[PDB]
Design a protein around this ligand. Sequence first.
Ligand SMILES: Nc1ncnc2c1ncn2[C@@H]1O[C@H](COP(=O)(O)OP(=O)(O)OC[C@H]2O[C@@H](O)[C@H](O)[C@@H]2O)[C@@H](O)[C@H]1O
Ligand SMILES: Nc1ncnc2c1ncn2[C@@H]1O[C@H](COP(=O)(O)OP(=O)(O)OC[C@H]2O[C@@H](O)[C@H](O)[C@@H]2O)[C@@H](O)[C@H]1O
Ligand SMILES: [Ca+2]
Ligand SMILES: [Ca+2]
Lengths: 48, 431, 48, 287, 19
Amino acid sequence: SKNGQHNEIAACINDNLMAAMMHNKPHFVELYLGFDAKIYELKPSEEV
Amino acid sequence: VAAKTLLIENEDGKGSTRMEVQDFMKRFHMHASEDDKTGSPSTAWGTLRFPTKEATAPYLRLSVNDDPEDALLFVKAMLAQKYGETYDRPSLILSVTGGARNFTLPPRLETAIAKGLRLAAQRTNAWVVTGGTNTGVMKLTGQIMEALSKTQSHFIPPTIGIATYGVIIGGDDMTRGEPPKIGLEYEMHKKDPPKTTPLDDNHNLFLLVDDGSTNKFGKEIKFRAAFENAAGQAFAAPVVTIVVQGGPGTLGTALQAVRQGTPIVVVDGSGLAADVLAYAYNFMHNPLTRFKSYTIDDLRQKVAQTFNPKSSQQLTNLLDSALECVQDPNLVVVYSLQESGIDEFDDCILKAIFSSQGKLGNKLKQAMYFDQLDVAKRALSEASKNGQHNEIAACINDNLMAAMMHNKPHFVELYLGFDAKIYELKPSEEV
Amino acid sequence: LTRFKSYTIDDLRQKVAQTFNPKSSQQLTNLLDSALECVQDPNLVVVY
Amino acid sequence: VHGHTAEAAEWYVPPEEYPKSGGVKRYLIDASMVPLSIMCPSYDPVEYTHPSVAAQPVWADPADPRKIKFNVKDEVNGKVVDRTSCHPSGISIDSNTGRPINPWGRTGMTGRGLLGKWGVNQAADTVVTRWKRSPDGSILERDGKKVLEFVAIQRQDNKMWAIPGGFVDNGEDVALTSGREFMEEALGMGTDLMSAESKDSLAALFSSGTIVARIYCEDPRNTDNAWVETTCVNFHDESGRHAARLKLQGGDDAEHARWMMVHGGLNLFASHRTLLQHVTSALNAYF
Amino acid sequence: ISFRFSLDQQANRLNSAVA
Ligand SMILES: Nc1ncnc2c1ncn2[C@@H]1O[C@H](COP(=O)(O)OP(=O)(O)OC[C@H]2O[C@@H](O)[C@H](O)[C@@H]2O)[C@@H](O)[C@H]1O
Ligand SMILES: Nc1ncnc2c1ncn2[C@@H]1O[C@H](COP(=O)(O)OP(=O)(O)OC[C@H]2O[C@@H](O)[C@H](O)[C@@H]2O)[C@@H](O)[C@H]1O
Ligand SMILES: [Ca+2]
Ligand SMILES: [Ca+2]
C-alpha cells in the first residue's frame, strides 16, 4: 500500500477474501473487506 | 421568491445596515473578453441548484480587480440572510488544496484525513475553502463535508469554492439573463466548448474569479490568499492550509501561504507534491536518524520523477521555490501515519495553530476547542516561567468566559487555578 | 547533569548585571566574587 | 558513460540588460568565446558609464585613468587603496586609453558602469556561521557531515538573497569594512539600539575571524574596465552562545535577514555559492 | 544525551572588533 502497489492488492483481494471465507478465518475476512474489496464481486472457482 | 434587500455589515464591524441588492452588487465587474480591463457589471450572480442536493448554493462571478473585503462582506451578508444576524462566527479557517486530477489514496490515510477534517470542522465551526471544482481532492473534501450535512442539524459551516471563471462550463448560460437566477438547474454533463471543468455540487458557495481569459489556470491563487488573510484578520481567526498530494500549482499556493505567514499542514504519504514538501521538511529540519541519508540530489530526482519539467532551468526554479518555502520550520507541520498516528491529525492542526503569530487568548481558545489540556498547561507554564505573567492575566478572563460557555470544566478549573478572579467577568456585548 | 553543561561565568556575570544593576564594574566584580565564594562548599547549599 | 562531455565550460557571462541603467543592453557573446587567450575578432563592446558615477562622488576615481599605478598599494588623497588583483598574470594596461583590461575575460561592455573605481573593486563579504542545531541540542548531520547555518540578507535592488558585504572605503581595511557592513545591513545598527553586553557578545564573535578566500566575483555590474574581487571573512561560532544573542532586523539596503542552511542548490547573488563552498570546505561541513 | 554531547564537542587570522 505504501509503495504504490495498490493494483496488485486489488487484483488478488477477491480471491483471498473468497479463500478466507471458505476456511473460517473471520479476522482475515474483516481485514480483506477493510482493504477495498467489494463484497458483490466474488467469483466461483469452477464454471456452472 | 427572490430577495430584494440585504443586510450588509458596516466597515466599522458594529452592526449591519439594510441596503438594496442592486446597489451593493454594482461594485462587482465581469470581463466579456481578455482585451477588456474596466469591464461591465456582473450579471452572473444568484443560486445554482444541483441534482441530489437539498440545499441551494449561491454563486458570484467577480473580477480580479474587485476588493476581497467586498466579497467578504458578500459572504457575511449571505450568512446573515440565511441564518440570521447571530450566526456562528468561525474561529478557524481550513484551506484544502491539492491535486486537481483524480488520484487514489490508501484507505487508512483517506479515513484519517476524512476523520480529522470532519472533527476539526465540526468542533471549531470552521470555514473550509477549496478550489470549488468537481474533480479530485476538492470534490473529495466536498464529499467529506457532505457527511457533515448529514451528521449535523441547524447550522452548516460554509464551503466557499474559489475557481477561475474562464474554465467553468456554463459561464455563458450563467451570464445571460436578468439575475438573480433563483434555483438555476446546473447541468454538469453538458459539453460547453472549450471547457471541461464542472463545479462541485457539495460546495455551499462559489466565487468565480474572471480576467477575460479562457482555459488558463492558476489565475485565482493570489485573490484566494488575499481573501483568506482578509477573513483571518476580520474574524481574528488563524488560517491553516492543508496540503494533500498536489501538482505544480499546489507549490505556488503553498508558497503564497507561507510568505503571508499562514501555516501549512502537509499530509505525508499522499504522494506527489506533498511527498516533496515533506522530503524537504525532513531534509532541512528533522533531527531523527532515518532522515540522515536525505540529500538535495535525491530530492531533485524526486521532483523530476513527479512533476516532469521540460527544461533544467524550470526544475532548478521549482526546487529553489520548494526549498525557499520550508525555510521557516514553524510554518510547516508534516503529518505522517507511521510516526504520528491515525487519530493525531487534529493535534497537527493545533500544532500549526500554536506555531503562528502570538495571541495567547486565541491559542488558548483553540486549545480549549480541541480538548488538549496538556498543550494549554505547557504553554501557560512556559509563559509563567519566562516572566510573561501579565499576558496570562490579560487574557485569562476571556479564556475563562469562553471555557464556561463551551462546557469544558477541566479548562475552567485550570484557568481558575491560574489566578483568574471569578467576579471580573465581562459580557461580550454591551447591555 | 547535561543541561548545566553550557553554563559559563560570562553568562552568570550578565545575569548578575541584568538583575542587580551595579553602578561600577568593580562593584559587579566584588558581587560576583562574593557570590562565587559563597557556593564554594557544595554541602552548605541545597537548590529546590 | 557520457561520451562527448567536453570537460565543463564553467565560464561566467553577465546578463544582457545592465541593472538600474534604464534598459541599456550590452553586446552579447556566447560563453565559449570569453577568455582573453583566444583572439575572437568580432568584438564591438559598448561604452557606458552610469550618471551617479559620472557625478564624481568621494568613492569614485577620476574619469581620466592616466598616471594611476596598478597592482600595488596606491595613495589617493592620502588614503591607501589596494588595486592588486588575485589573478596570477596580473593586470595589463591598454596603451591607447590607459584604462585597465579585465584579465578574467570579456563582458562585452567597456567603461566603468556602476562601479566607481577603475580596475579592481575590492569587496568584503562577511559569513557569520553557526552549527544548525535541533532543540535537544544535537547538531544536524546530512551526508555524514555536520550542517552549518549562515546569516543572509535580502538585497534592496533585485530582491534576491545574498551574503552581507560591501565595497571597501578609502583609508580603511577589510576588518572594519566587514564588521561595519554586518552591523549596518544585518542588524540595522546606526542607521543606540543594543547596548553593553550584546556588543560584548558580538565582540567575542568578532574576535575569531578567518579569511577563507580572495576570489573573482561573478557580479552582473562587472565590465571590461571595472570588476569586483572579494575577500571573504568567516566568523564561526563553535559553541553557538554568541550567535544566539543576535537580534536580526533588516536595515539600510537590506529588506529581511534570516539564518539559512548551506547547500549546493542555493541561488545567491554573484559568486557567493563559491564563497560558501570555501567556508564549508574549511570547516568540513556539508555542501 | 550526555554521550551525544560529549560526542558533539568531540568533533589568515583577522580581528574585526574595531568596527
Ligand atoms: N483548480 C483546478 N480545477 C480543476 N482542474 C485544474 C485546476 N487547476 C489546474 N487544473 C488542470 O488539471 C490538471 C491537474 O492538476 P494537478 O497538477 O493535479 O493539480 P494542480 O495543478 O496543482 O492544481 C492546483 C489547484 O487545485 C487546488 O487544490 C488549488 O487551490 C490550486 O488552485 C492540470 O494539468 C491543470 O491543467
Ligand atoms: N567602488 C564602489 N563601487 C560601487 N559602489 C560604491 C563604491 N564605493 C562605494 N559605493 C557605494 O556603495 C553602494 C553599494 O552598496 P554596498 O552595500 O556598499 O555594497 P553592495 O553592492 O550592496 O555589496 C557588494 C557585494 O557585491 C559582491 O560582488 C560582493 O561580494 C559584495 O557582497 C553603492 O550604492 C555606492 O553608492
Ligand atoms: Ca550590501
Ligand atoms: Ca551597505
